[PDB]
Each structure stands twice: as structure tokens, then as C-alpha cells.
């Protein structure tokens, strides 16, 4: 599935991301527009041995077990092919124990070079 943004919102708000953590909800959208491009299915496969799974495009090294990747810690106690699901539950899920485990939205290269101290509310504006 690729979301629209204001479709997207709407799913993150009604699972709690508006304010996690004291990220707003257009953190999250943004977050997901240049992790993923709105798409569900995306995925990158690394040189490293892991891979970046989904909407958020989460890392198999630590994040979801997808079997093949070295030093595997699956904090999210996941398959990484339930990130690939069309609903974005476990996405979100995960989204929220990465942030639990002591990071911020830093953790994902996209945010911090692409929405951190930008204009992230655009991405609800208008929804
Ligand atoms: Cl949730
Ligand atoms: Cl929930
Ligand atoms: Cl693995
Ligand atoms: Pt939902
Ligand atoms: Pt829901
Ligand atoms: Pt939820
Ligand atoms: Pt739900």
C-alpha cells in the first residue's frame, strides 16, 4: 500500500504517535515520506547483512528478526515481514519500542536529515 499523507496521519494519530515521546504526528509523516515514500512494501537490502523493512524502513540488525541478518537482537520480538503489512500497526509498534530503547527519532537517518528543524507539520497541513 502506498498512503497519502493525510491517510497516513490519520492511521499513526488513532494508534498514539501524535505527541510519542514529544514527537508531534508530522514527525512520524515525514519520518515515513523519505524512509519510504509512503510505501508499505518498501525494502533495502544492505551490504551489512541486514535490511530496512517497511513504511519505516526498520533494521534487521537490531529491530526485527528476518533470519539472515548477523547479530540479530530482535528488540521488537518480530518478524521483519510484519513490518510489510499494509496495515501499519506493528510498524508503529516497533516504531515505538525503538524510541523506548533509548533513542530519539535520530535513530532514523531520514528524520534527522530530512525533517529534523524543517517545517514538519506540512506534512499534516491540510489533512
Ligand atoms: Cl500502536
Ligand atoms: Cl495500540
Ligand atoms: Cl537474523
Ligand atoms: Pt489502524
Ligand atoms: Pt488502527
Ligand atoms: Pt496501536
Ligand atoms: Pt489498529
Not at 504517535?17 to 514527525?27: E, T
Not at 515525514?30 to 544492505?46: G, V, W, Y
Not at 510489510?84 to 515505538?96: E, H, P
Request: charged content about 20%; aromatic content about 10%; glycine content about 10%.
Amino acid at each position: 500500500k502506498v498512503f497519502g499523507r493525510c491517510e497516513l496521519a490519520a492511521a499513526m494519530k488513532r494508534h498514539g504517535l501524535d505527541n510519542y515521546r514529544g514527537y508531534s504526528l508530522g514527525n512520524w509523516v515525514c519520518a515515513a515520506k523519505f524512509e519510504s515514500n509512503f510505501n508499505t512494501q518498501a525494502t533495502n537490502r544492505n551490504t551489512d547483512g541486514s535490511t530496512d523493512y517497511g513504511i519505516l524502513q526498520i533494521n534487521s540488525r537490531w529491530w526485527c528478526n528476518d533470519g539472515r541478518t548477523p547479530g540479530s537482537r530482535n528488540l521488537c520480538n518480530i518478524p521483519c515481514s510484519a513490518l510489510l503489512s499494509s496495515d501499519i500497526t506493528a510498524s508503529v509498534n516497533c516504531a515505538k519500542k525503538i524510541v523506548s530503547d533509548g533513542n530519539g527519532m535520530n535513530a532514523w537517518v531520514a528524520w534527522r536529515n530530512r525533517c529534523k528543524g524543517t517545517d514538519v507539520q506540512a506534512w499534516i497541513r491540510g489533512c
